[PDB]
């Protein structure tokens, strides 16, 4: 599926980057977003590099986060094969 992590330890009150790996899916025809309990964060930027058929060797996107006792962070991915994108939530509040 998807395996999310962070670049640094979860410190309640810091801003830092949410890391969502998506591997095996040629970047050209997939969709991935960074969420909060199924809510689009939005401050996320990675531009696809498809060109033609593309080559998945490392897909990652990045968004500003601040962990709180209330908010859960998830990363959603969809491909033509799936009829529904999947959510992977980061172990700290799930």
UniProtKB/Swiss-Prot annotation:
UniProt subcellular location: Secreted; Cell surface
Result of altering residue 55 to G: Decreases tendency towards amyloid formation
GO biological process: amyloid fibril formation; antigen processing and presentation of endogenous peptide antigen via MHC class I; antigen processing and presentation of exogenous peptide antigen via MHC class II; antigen processing and presentation of exogenous protein antigen via MHC class Ib, TAP-dependent; cellular response to iron ion; cellular response to iron(III) ion; cellular response to nicotine; intracellular iron ion homeostasis
GO function terms (MF aspect): identical protein binding; MHC class II protein complex binding; peptide antigen binding; protein homodimerization activity; structural molecule activity
This protein's record includes keyword Glycoprotein: yes
Positions annotated with a glycan in the UniProt record: 14, 36, 43, 53, 86, 89
Record keywords: Amyloid, Amyloidosis, Disease variant, Disulfide bond, Glycation, Glycoprotein, Immunity, Immunoglobulin domain, MHC I, Pyrrolidone carboxylic acid, Secreted, Signal
Cysteine pairings via disulfide bonds: 20-75
CC terms in the record's Gene Ontology section: cytosol; early endosome lumen; early endosome membrane; endoplasmic reticulum; endoplasmic reticulum lumen; ER to Golgi transport vesicle membrane; external side of plasma membrane; extracellular exosome
Domain called Ig-like C1-type: residue spans: 2-88
Outcome of swapping residue 54 to P: Increases tendency towards amyloid formation
Function, in words: Component of the class I major histocompatibility complex (MHC). Involved in the presentation of peptide antigens to the immune system. Exogenously applied M.tuberculosis EsxA or EsxA-EsxB (or EsxA expressed in host) binds B2M and decreases its export to the cell surface (total protein levels do not change), probably leading to defects in class I antigen presentation.
Quaternary assembly: Heterodimer of an alpha chain and a beta chain. Beta-2-microglobulin is the beta-chain of major histocompatibility complex class I molecules. Polymers of beta 2-microglobulin can be found in tissues from patients on long-term hemodialysis. B2M alone (not in complex with HLA-I) interacts with M.tuberculosis EsxA (ESAT-6) and an EsxA-EsxB (CFP-10) complex; the tripartite complex can be detected in the host endoplasmic reticulum. The B2M-EsxA complex can be detected in patients with pleural tuberculosis and is stable from pH 4.0 to 8.0 and in the presence of 2M NaCl.
Family: Belongs to the beta-2-microglobulin family.
Disease tied to this entry: Immunodeficiency 43: A disorder characterized by marked reduction in serum concentrations of immunoglobulins and albumin, and hypoproteinemia due to hypercatabolism. Patients may suffer from recurrent respiratory tract infections and severe skin disease.
Entry protein name: Beta-2-microglobulin
Organism whose genome encodes this protein: Homo sapiens
Region of the whole protein represented: 27 to 119 of 119
């Amino acid at each position: 599926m998807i395996q999310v992590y962070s670049r640094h330890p979860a410190e309640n009150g810091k801003s830092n980057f949410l890391n969502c790996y998506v591997s095996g899916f040629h970047p050209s025809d997939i969709e991935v977003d960074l969420l909060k309990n199924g809510e689009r964060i939005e401050k996320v930027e990675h531009s696809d590099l498809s060109f033609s058929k593309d080559w998945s060797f490392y897909l990652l996107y990045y968004t500003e986060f601040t962990p709180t006792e209330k908010d859960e962070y998830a990363c959603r991915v969809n491909h033509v094969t799936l009829s529904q994108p999947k959510i992977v939530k980061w172990d700290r509040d799930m």
